[PDB]
Each structure stands twice: as structure tokens, then as C-alpha cells.
Curated annotation (Swiss-Prot):
Ca(2+) 2 binds at D59, G91, N93, D95. One of its GO terms (molecular function) is zinc ion binding. Keywords: Calcium, Collagen degradation, Cytoplasm, Disulfide bond, Extracellular matrix, Hydrolase, Immunity, Innate immunity, Metal-binding, Metalloprotease, Nucleus, Protease, Repeat, Secreted, Signal, Zinc, Zymogen. It is found in: Secreted, Extracellular space, Extracellular matrix; Nucleus; Cytoplasm. This is Stromelysin-1. GO terms for cellular component: cytosol; extracellular matrix; extracellular region; extracellular space; mitochondrion; nucleus. It comes from Homo sapiens. Zn(2+) 2 binds at H119, H123, H129. The conserved cysteine present in the cysteine-switch motif binds the catalytic zinc ion, thus inhibiting the enzyme. The dissociation of the cysteine from the zinc ion upon the activation-peptide release activates the enzyme. The gene is MMP3.
Length: 168
């Protein structure tokens, strides 16, 4: 596992998130479900808890956008970068953005939203990239034949608990 330089982390255990907008590609229930399953992956192995805000500024602001969208790293149309997220901190830090020039899916065939979201929230929490080809934080996208096989590797658990510790 790898952390970000300077090891940014949250110095609090109760985090908030807001889904500011939604993709055309899936019903809202499917997107909500994907992000909350992605949050839950990290909750289970840490002391962190997340709660949702429907207005105002949350710690982790989640949005869908294309091309130039108000930061230093515009998206690039279909393919290539699917999404990105920022390390812990105020303002844009912690936020996760998804490229809506992708076609987001809940299945194992397209660009799966849950898998990408789980990875991106790993960044939001302070994890960088792993060399382990089995890890969630490996830098190259791929999916699975069976999503029910999905699991955090020991590497991901070790990395995140190195920031926040194990669950009480
Ligand atoms: O790394 C990224 O997020 C960069 C942009 C990027 C490049 N430097 C960065 C530094 C900090 C934050 C973001 C970036 N976007 S990206 O769209 O290229 C991207 C998105 C998701 C992933 N996955 C890795 C494998 C994972 C998996 C694991 C186990 C089983 C099944 C599936 C599924 C998701 C990787 C890369
Ligand atoms: Ca933020
Ligand atoms: Ca793209
Ligand atoms: Ca789209
Ligand atoms: Zn962005
Ligand atoms: Zn990444």
C-alpha cells in the first residue's frame, strides 16, 4: 500500500458526503446504492462513519461532470480517465468526480460505478496506489466476472488501518 505524500488524513471519525448531481445512465436508486456500498467497504474496516447531507458543504462532495468542470484536471471524453478524487482536507480535498462521458453500469460488462467509486473513496480517505494486482487501490481499471466475489485485499486493509486504525 501507499499513502499520499505528507500523509493527509482526516482528524475526525464522522465524515459527511453529498451526492450533488446524478448521471443519466442509471436510476437514482442504483447510484445511491453504489455509493453507499462503496462507503460501507471502508466503514467496516475502520472507526469511520459516514452520513449523508442533502444540502450544504459535505466533506466528500460527489458529482458527475464532463470536460472542464472547475478544477485543474478536466475530463477527457469517453475512455481513459473515468473518475478522480482528492486527498483529505478542506474544500476540493476529499471530493470525488465522475466522468459522465463514460457509460456507467451496475453490471460486470461496462464501466461499473460501484468499483470505481470504491477506489475513488479510497483516495478521499488518504490511500494512494498499490502494487498488489489484487488490491482495490491498484491503479488500473478492470472489473470482475462475479461482483459477489468482490473483496478488499489485505493490502487495502493494512493501508487504511494504518491511517485510522481498526474498528472498535
Ligand atoms: O487512479 C485513479 O482514480 C485515476 C485518476 C488518477 C491518476 N492518478 C491519481 C492520483 C490520485 C487520485 C486519482 C488519480 N482514475 S481511473 O479512472 O484511471 C481509475 C479508476 C478506477 C480504478 N480501479 C482499479 C481497480 C479496481 C478493482 C480492484 C479489484 C477488483 C475489481 C476492480 C476498480 C477501480 C483505477 C483507475
Ligand atoms: Ca471536500
Ligand atoms: Ca474519460
Ligand atoms: Ca454518462
Ligand atoms: Zn474533477
Ligand atoms: Zn486511483
Amino acid at each position: 500500500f501507499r499513502t499520499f505524500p505528507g500523509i493527509p488524513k482526516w482528524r475526525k471519525t464522522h465524515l459527511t458526503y453529498r451526492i450533488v448531481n446524478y448521471t443519466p445512465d442509471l436510476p437514482k436508486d442504483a447510484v445511491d446504492s453504489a455509493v453507499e456500498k462503496a462507503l460501507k467497504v471502508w466503514e467496516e474496516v475502520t472507526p469511520l462513519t459516514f452520513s449523508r447531507l442533502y444540502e450544504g458543504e459535505a466533506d466528500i462532495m460527489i458529482s458527475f461532470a464532463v470536460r472542464e468542470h472547475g478544477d485543474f484536471y478536466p475530463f477527457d471524453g469517453p475512455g481513459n480517465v473515468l473518475a478522480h478524487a482528492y486527498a483529505p482536507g478542506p474544500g476540493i480535498n476529499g471530493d470525488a468526480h465522475f466522468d459522465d462521458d463514460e457509460q456507467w453500469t451496475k453490471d460486470t460488462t461496462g464501466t461499473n460505478l460501484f468499483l470505481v467509486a470504491a477506489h475513488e473513496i479510497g483516495h478521499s480517505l488518504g490511500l494512494f496506489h498499490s502494487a498488489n494486482t489484487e488490491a482495490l487501490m491498484y491503479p488500473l481499471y478492470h472489473s470482475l466476472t462475479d461482483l459477489t466475489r468482490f473483496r478488499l485485499s489485505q493490502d487495502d486493509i493494512n493501508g487504511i488501518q494504518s491511517l485510522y486504525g481498526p474498528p472498535p
